Amino acid sequence: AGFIENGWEGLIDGWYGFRHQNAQGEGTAADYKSTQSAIDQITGKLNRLIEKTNQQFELIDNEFNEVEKQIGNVINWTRDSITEVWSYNAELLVAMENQHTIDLADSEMDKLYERVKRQLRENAEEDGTGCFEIFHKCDDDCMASIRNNTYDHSKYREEAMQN
Amino acid sequence: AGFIENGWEGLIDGWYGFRHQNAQGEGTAADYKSTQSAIDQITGKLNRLIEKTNQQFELIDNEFNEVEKQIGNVINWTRDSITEVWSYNAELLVAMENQHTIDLADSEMDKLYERVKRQLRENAEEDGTGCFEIFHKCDDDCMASIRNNTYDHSKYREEAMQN
Amino acid sequence: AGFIENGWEGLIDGWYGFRHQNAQGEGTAADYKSTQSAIDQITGKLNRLIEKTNQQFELIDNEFNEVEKQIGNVINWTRDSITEVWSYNAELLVAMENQHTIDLADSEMDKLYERVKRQLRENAEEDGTGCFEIFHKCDDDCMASIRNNTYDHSKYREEAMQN
Amino acid sequence: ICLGHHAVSNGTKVNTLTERGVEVVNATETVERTNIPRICSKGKRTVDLGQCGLLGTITGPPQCDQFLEFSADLIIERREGSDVCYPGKFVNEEALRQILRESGGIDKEAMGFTYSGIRTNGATSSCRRSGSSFYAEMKWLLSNTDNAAFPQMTKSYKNTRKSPALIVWGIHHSVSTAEQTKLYGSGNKLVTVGSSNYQQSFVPSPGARTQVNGQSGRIDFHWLMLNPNDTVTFSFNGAFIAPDRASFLRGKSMGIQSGVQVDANCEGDCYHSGGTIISNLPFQNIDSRAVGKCPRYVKQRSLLLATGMKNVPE
Amino acid sequence: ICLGHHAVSNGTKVNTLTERGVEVVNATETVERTNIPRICSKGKRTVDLGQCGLLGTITGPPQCDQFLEFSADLIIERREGSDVCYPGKFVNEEALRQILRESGGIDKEAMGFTYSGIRTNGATSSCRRSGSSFYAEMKWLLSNTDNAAFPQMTKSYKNTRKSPALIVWGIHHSVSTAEQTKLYGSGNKLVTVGSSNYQQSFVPSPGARTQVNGQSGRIDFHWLMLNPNDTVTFSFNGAFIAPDRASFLRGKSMGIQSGVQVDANCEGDCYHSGGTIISNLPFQNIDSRAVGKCPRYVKQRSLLLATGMKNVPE
Amino acid sequence: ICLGHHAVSNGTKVNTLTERGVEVVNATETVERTNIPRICSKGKRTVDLGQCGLLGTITGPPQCDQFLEFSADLIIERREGSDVCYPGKFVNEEALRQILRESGGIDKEAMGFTYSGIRTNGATSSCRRSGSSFYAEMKWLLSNTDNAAFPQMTKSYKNTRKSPALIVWGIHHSVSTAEQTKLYGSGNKLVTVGSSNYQQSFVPSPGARTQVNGQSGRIDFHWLMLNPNDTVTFSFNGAFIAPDRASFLRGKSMGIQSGVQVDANCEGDCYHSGGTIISNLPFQNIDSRAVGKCPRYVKQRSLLLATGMKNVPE
């Protein structure tokens, strides 16, 4: 989500995907492993924050018949203090979790990219904006070999090396 | 701020910059985009932490005529507890924010470096300490083409490839 | 701890290490700088969290002769509230620190790898799973030159370039 | 081959450590604002006191006759509830209320006070049943003849059980000193109450008050808790509302005050006067005085947690 | 071409999760320590009570004659303030103080008590004006002849307004029983006060005390709050300081105690006895008992937030 | 050449923001559960009151004769401790207890009360020494002849020191009114206590109570604190337990309640009734009412902090 200047609004298939254009047409298919990793991490955050405290608090005030003014002002004082504390905790918690979520997704995207880069070793070259310029024309089944991590790192090597 | 073994104390122009030495002299000019990104992020942190709570707390003690000892010790007990809580919150908050700030700056530096690396594709080679060894002599206007992200990724390619 | 598919349970020498196999036998020796960096960071976390508060709290209840019921329920109410607050703080603190610890170790591993990659410039090529395929047969003393960061980036260059 | 991330046209804005208003793909709420305007009592033993005040269940005015030995897991107080029929007040009333809310109900037991040489059937026009009645669990101790004297009497009761007993007596404050001498005879009247944790003694303060429920006299209601195998002693001589039966706590429960309707269709553990908070979120912004097992109240009305990635559209 | 980061010769040390003493480029403070030794009252309606005690504004000793109907957004108590001229004390004084601090001022209204058959102009050498005077809002109820009897009197006042009224009466504790029989006649004296939320009655406790302000007798000051359309009844017969006027709360304000000077040049919302905390920082290390809209007090004196990057010099 | 990380066969599971049960190399505990079942008093001045109640050290029953002028840094209360020998109770007892716990000991000083025309050597069968004795620091004020009258007496004491003095007196509640007229003579008895911050007066409430320690009469114990250069005045006339000596606070200390044994071998600053918490961890799960310099109590029994990396085995 950095130098990948924008997202693909048509990729309703998953979080991350491959979109290729070689000679045998067009391609756009999502990747399952990285998407599932991010989904499981965010799911972990959600399941951890959604929580029911088994701690029970009883009444201490009285809404119908106001208690003595001194003890009432001490009670109100304490309740307002605890309210301040929990407001702060909620604010900071939400902000921090959001930061780590965004940076988490960016990290997963970077991992996907780096792995695909290392999968093809000198068979293709880097361009600038998250694409890989192929120097040997790779058909659709070869792209699918790149996707499911089966593309060979040498059986197309010198052919693309001389180019 | 990792393997860039030290900072440039003379770069009073910005946070990050380019310092080159080719054949037409010397160069040291700051980069605006990354510096402005880090500055805007730190600014966001500052504007979020500097905050005035609209919550008003009234008096509960009495400095001139001490209140009854029991309720006074309950009040002092509660106030000391809340003081402990806010001291902890302040400490942890400051430490965490500092960590994320330092790692944030390091991340921005890494982004600048990686982008400049991908901007020149095989025209130059990596050395070791955050510099790029040019294999075609690039004049000052070409360095300025590297700075404002206009250096061409192929119009100097085989010339530096044979070297 | 990402695409390095597993750890070396026999490396009881340190946290990170080099394991090579060239022609003069086998090799497995730990790296001191990165390991010591991570150890010093975790040590910093431990020394910061282990802390004795110089704040002293006195008695407010009475275990032998129960105090008046109203003030007793206010006291119990406040104590339970503070207990909730500190339970939350402990939980979130431990979870956050663990996250930053794991990601910290992963970061240090990545730094070690990237440095070793940049130390040999075109003398070897990347494979896939955290190893470096040598294209010039490097003896044991040359591997030790890689370890203590003294391997030369050009004195083996064209020999491995033609391969 | 290229590789990227997904996006949407209409994102959701959240706040982070760095920015305020970052657009992300998906987000969820962390502050519950939805309320159920009913007291969700499914699966719980509920006792709706209605017009009967809580403390009244110990003394027994007419409106509490059907609550003298209740048993509950959830006790609901109502604003229309009245603790007294004859105008009076409870000393340390809120403490006794907080005791009775988590008692799980009460269990009466006769104290066995027999009187020799006085009358014992006082009544008034306010505490009304068939005709002029009185507090069910209490006995208005008077003098035999319209206008006689009160013999210095002494009674006592020992708690023969394993839990603390609840002892409640009264002090009559008549409309005048002539009426006090009419009911209990002239001379000073002293009411002494003693035990192992208790001193005390009391005496009346006759005089005119505001006409509440028709009468101007008042009744002070006092109470203590007898420990097991501990005895309580009453040394009195007039202006005395004697206890017939003592109370014992049944178990554990929770007391709330509310003005909404009971409902056995929904289940809930967090209650306030406006209804029930049925939620799994960690925070809430409905009532800071909510009781039970609740999310923590916060001042903010909304705090959005990001469940998706950064949204960067074309 | 090379690329790096900036640095400085003299950095700023901060603390992180990992280390303690990391040198960074720039840092800022998060714990306010600067104080303004004045009560910044710019734009606020301030009432500096001075030598007049807060509670005195309800009774009206001489030093409070210019504060019987004040109106404020900020109320300042002073250490030299005195609540009484004749030696006495207020029952539940701190509660009434906390009530009056956030009242926004008071508004008196005559209660309309007319007396038939007694005297009503008591005075003493302590409460001094032209000569021997008394509390402005109070009336010392005595007996007609040096030494007579006190007729059992009954007065009453109904709150005819929409806010709760403040009712304050007194009980005289004379230096001796002979002086009590001199002022109010012999026999027991009973002071009964009743309403809808109130029971009570009181009587005096004559005897010698320490000579404060010249006198040895004391005066108990009691108070209650009449709800709207509720009546208060006083059944008394001697040793009575009757209320002339009742008090009504004006609105909302804040009360502080301080010994520094008022200043209408600076604006402030956080006050303590030493001055005003003018800051935007989230924390402060000046006074844990500060009131108003304040940063949260912490024990630490300094907590530096990093505003720059890691400082790695040559 | 390859490069990797280390691992182990048996890891340690921890929780993170993302997952719950991540296996790491090494982990440490953050919640202390180990307890030392002794009161670690090494290096501290300890006073184990034993059978002597804390408040008793001010009045002086027999069991407190060896504690009338103690000096401590650590004060231990025991469950077998008794504050009284003659059956009685302390008004505002818990406040005085909390005062005495952090007093660092007490220092008595004779108040110098001389009586002319009454007796002054009351005793009873309960407060036993050689024979029938009484509270050491107190004097039972009676009338001269079995059955006479009590002259209206007035005493006073000025605090001539720089710290507040502790003044404690008593009110006798006899078994009957005939016994009260026997000890102090007939007629009303009024006990007035006055100072600069104090009003008050009291009188007795005779009557039968439960037989505790053999007797049925009670004694109310009241107390105030005289400020420096302030005087206290007692205007009494019967049913009076006069103070012989006043108390002065020594310095600073801490009071605990415990049933475990003292130990001068271990050092500790966090105490509870079960022992001592010797730990450096920030949290604890042993006692929420622990006092001293303690880790913060949390509900969780274990919270594991990761000290190693992610454990990925073959």
Ligand SMILES: *[C@@H]1O[C@H](CO)[C@@H](O)[C@H](O)[C@H]1NC(C)=O
């Ligand atoms: C405490 O706050 C409530 C509002 O939540 C208010 O109604 C009540 O009057 C306050 N207590 C006192 C003693 O004023």
Ligand SMILES: *[C@@H]1O[C@H](CO)[C@@H](O)[C@H](O)[C@H]1NC(C)=O
């Ligand atoms: C509460 O703490 C203050 C110091 O902030 C102290 O002056 C006061 O005496 C304490 N309260 C009691 C009842 O001791």
Ligand SMILES: *[C@@H]1O[C@H](CO)[C@@H](O)[C@H](O)[C@H]1NC(C)=O
């Ligand atoms: C407060 O909680 C304790 C348990 O920690 C309990 O023993 C005590 O009875 C409670 N207080 C009251 C007034 O019930």
Ligand SMILES: *[C@@H]1O[C@H](CO)[C@@H](O)[C@H](O)[C@H]1NC(C)=O
């Ligand atoms: C978005 O988050 C909500 C949270 O309640 C969830 O129910 C929904 O399934 C999520 N949808 C997507 C597309 O992530």
Ligand SMILES: *[C@@H]1O[C@H](CO)[C@@H](O)[C@H](O)[C@H]1NC(C)=O
């Ligand atoms: C209470 O008294 C009875 C009377 O015999 C005795 O059996 C029982 O053990 C006593 N229980 C306690 C707790 O004292």
Ligand SMILES: *[C@@H]1O[C@H](CO)[C@@H](O)[C@H](O)[C@H]1NC(C)=O
């Ligand atoms: C450093 O931080 C302070 C914080 O108050 C700010 O005023 C100043 O402008 C900053 N200077 C630089 C060079 O960052």
Ligand SMILES: *[C@@H]1O[C@H](CO)[C@@H](O)[C@H](O)[C@H]1NC(C)=O
């Ligand atoms: C108070 O009494 C007056 C008298 O007629 C009446 O008009 C008014 O509605 C009453 N207000 C309330 C709140 O009872």
Ligand SMILES: *[C@@H]1O[C@H](CO)[C@@H](O)[C@H](O)[C@H]1NC(C)=O
């Ligand atoms: C593991 O952590 C514990 C924490 O107490 C420490 O004592 C021990 O030395 C550590 N061992 C290793 C191998 O990290």
Ligand SMILES: *[C@@H]1O[C@H](CO)[C@@H](O)[C@H](O)[C@H]1NC(C)=O
């Ligand atoms: C107390 O009174 C003595 C009597 O002369 C005097 O010397 C001393 O200064 C006074 N101290 C205070 C604090 O009033």
